[PDB]
Design a binder for this molecule. Structure first.
Ligand SMILES: [Cl-]
Ligand SMILES: [Cl-]
Lengths: 434, 434
């Protein structure tokens, strides 16, 4: 009823059966071809894995177990007196496929507060990291070191039946999610608040609120932003590097700590984790050059000048998505309610009406609408969260929810070791000649 | 003797060859993708280009076209030694060329010069508790070593895409150099009461500095280590450690982050524990039947094992049609240096008996042993009995292959790895649409 684990125990056999039926019906049905270009090109366009928690609708944007972002905003439980969806309820939805009740979210908030403690060796290690060690490296190293606490690792080594793997994977995922804001807040305070204490967990608060308390923030509106931010960055299919790395490493039966830490090393890559920062840097330099209320007319000229000089507008454009990312829209709606006077947000809003038509006229970008990363930095900055290097850590804390929800299911459903076949160029030349 | 200049000459030629091949054959189909392949971990799917090694299904693994016996003959040895130096294997993987004596000597000196650890990493290692698994210590320390990444710093400043390989190469060389220091510290802190690893000797080869740092002095253990580190170096790109390094590397994560992620995958029980599983099984077998077991008695034990539905660890392969050449070279080593060892004699007796029984049974298609059937007994003979640590040795070896390929992935401009995921619901819809 409220124990997520019991709810999961009931859902798993039904899903195992549904999948077994589909595979017995269509296991050898062809769904795609592999080309030489896909092998050289990073598996671009190759259907390669089953990932249940989220799917991109090319007309509507990312869906979380079939629900759109606006649906999740309406349906997922809120904090008392709040309006933004709690990430606990997003996790419940990703794990169960079901919209949680108020009572189920409250249960989950309590679980995550109970589980949050860090072992002293990890606290020591965090405190000892130097300030030139990137926050993402601190994050990954600390999570790897937390595998000392893995009950899956311990139990597997002792011997456990394959039908029970998901049970201990679930426990370790719940524990890791619980601990993440403590780890992330320690990194933040050690780097940017002179090593001050993160303070204590409050058993009566939701996850995002314990997090903002530990970061040293007190603004109710920042906690609301954080609830929205952590919900909306939570998952985006399995093919992105962080999701896929967690999946791949997980498929070797590495525990959730090892799997998530590997994923963070992928998220740290400049081609995956830096879009928010790139946008904010660009907005900041623009606003310093043209000032805080440039006309629509003049801003368009600035954009053409940017593009005519060979540069791109950060945060705009998508290969597949045919409208504005719904994750951009929800951030826009938040800003219109809560910070409509802010000069940097007003620039972001002006760009939304100007940039898409310029990109369409230019004729290079496909689908020139903005994405989530076009809007996040200005909101963080408004609330005082200005340390851009740290922004990927926030993304990582969010993305734990999606990738660990799927990891539970990968183990419940018995997905095997991920093992594509590699070939050399010599080998491919031989193959295609045969 | 500058490996980097030799690489600079080879790179354009390969880039051109690949461009020409892809012009004609980019759209050529090399396989079909089925529903079962997606659920089954990409089993059978040709999904990536990995240049350094290729499995010949008749003969076993080849390193840039050379067999293991060819490498044993042709690769340079230490003065007064018989086993191939891993330095030369790395040279071969990077260049496709067999190094001269002088080139290997140069590379030994490079790796001795580059070995230094920053204080924070030494401290972190010394502070790890004894219940943190050696593989977790390894990955966490390598992640923290990214403070030393020159690629990370330079990329943030701006590097032209055609030159990424240059600083990737420098960081790989640095990481290889530092790995034995990290690994030896873990060993001594866990198993030698925190005693000092001592200093690097600039006149010694990599394996010898490593065994010195581990606290071993037996000349034949150093010989074993040279062979072990050469033979475990690479085995195509589809294994989890190789693929994880490739995936993470494709996001332009530096070699420290990419290798650390790879180690979290190698740590998984389905990838890095085969040596240990075999040795555990052999130990129990020897306790049950004793050291003087007749061929007749052992044969009966094997039939009984198979007739009861159980498998012999280390024996059997889906594709390889004969004994793994990595098993053979270890057998040859044991015959020269420890033929009297009782556990080796059991390993040798099983080689005589197990494949015959599997062939008579007629179910297993390729009844021959792999590398992991033979490695534990050699390590144990020399006093390296700490089975949890064995995967660290595998990881130090595998650095050579995955980092040789990482250089080439960047030199050739391989893009972000991004296959497409689908949900079960999505696949049902896709199949029904067609
Ligand atoms: Cl993403
Ligand atoms: Cl392997």
């Amino acid at each position: 009823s409220t124990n997520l684990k019991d709810i999961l125990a009931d859902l798993i056999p039904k899903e195992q059966a549904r999948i077994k039926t589909f595979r017995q019906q269509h296991g050898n049905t062809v769904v795609g071809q592999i080309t030489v270009d896909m092998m050289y090109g990073g598996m671009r366009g190759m259907k390669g894995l089953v990932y249940e928690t989220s799917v991109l609708d090319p007309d509507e944007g990312i869906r979380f177990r079939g629900y759109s972002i606006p649906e999740c905003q309406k349906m997922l439980p809120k904090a008392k007196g709040g309006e933004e969806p709690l990430p606990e309820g997003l996790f419940w939805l990703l794990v169960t496929g079901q919209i949680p009740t108020e009572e189920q979210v409250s249960w989950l908030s309590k679980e995550w507060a109970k589980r949050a403690a860090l072992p002293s060796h990890v606290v020591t290690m965090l405190d000892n990291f130097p300030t030139n060690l990137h926050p993402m490296s601190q994050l990954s190293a600390a999570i790897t070191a937390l595998n000392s606490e893995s009950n899956f690792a311990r139990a597997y080594a002792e011997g456990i039946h394959r039908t029970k793997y998901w049970e201990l994977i679930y426990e370790d995922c719940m524990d890791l999610i619980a601990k993440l804001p403590c780890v992330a807040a320690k990194i933040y305070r050690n780097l940017y608040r002179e090593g001050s204490s993160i303070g204590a967990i409050d058993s009566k608060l939701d996850w995002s609120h314990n997090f903002t308390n530990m970061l040293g923030y007190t603004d109710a509106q920042f906690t609301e932003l954080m609830r929205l931010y952590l919900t909306i960055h939570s998952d985006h299919e399995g093919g992105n590097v962080s999701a896929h790395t967690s999946h791949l490493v997980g498929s070797a039966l590495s525990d959730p700590y090892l799997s998530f830490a590997a994923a963070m090393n992928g998220l740290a890559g400049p081609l995956h984790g830096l879009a928010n920062q790139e946008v904010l840097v660009w907005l900041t330099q623009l606003q310093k050059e043209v000032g805080k209320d440039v006309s629509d007319e003049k801003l368009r000229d600035y954009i053409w000048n940017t593009l005519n000089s060979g540069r791109v507008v950060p945060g705009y454009g998508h290969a597949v998505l045919r409208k504005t990312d719904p994750r951009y829209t929800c951030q826009r709606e938040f800003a219109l309610k809560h910070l409509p006077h802010d000069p940097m947000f007003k620039l972001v809003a002006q760009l939304y009406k100007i940039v898409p038509n310029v990109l369409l006229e230019q004729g290079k970008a496909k689908n020139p609408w903005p994405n989530v990363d076009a809007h996040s930095g200005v909101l963080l900055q408004y609330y005082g969260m200005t340390e851009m290097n740290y922004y990927t850590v926030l993304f990582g804390v969010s993305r734990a929810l999606g990738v660990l929800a799927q990891l539970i299911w990968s183990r419940a459903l018995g997905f095997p070791l991920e093992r594509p076949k590699s070939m050399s160029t010599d080998g491919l030349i031989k193959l295609v000649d045969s």
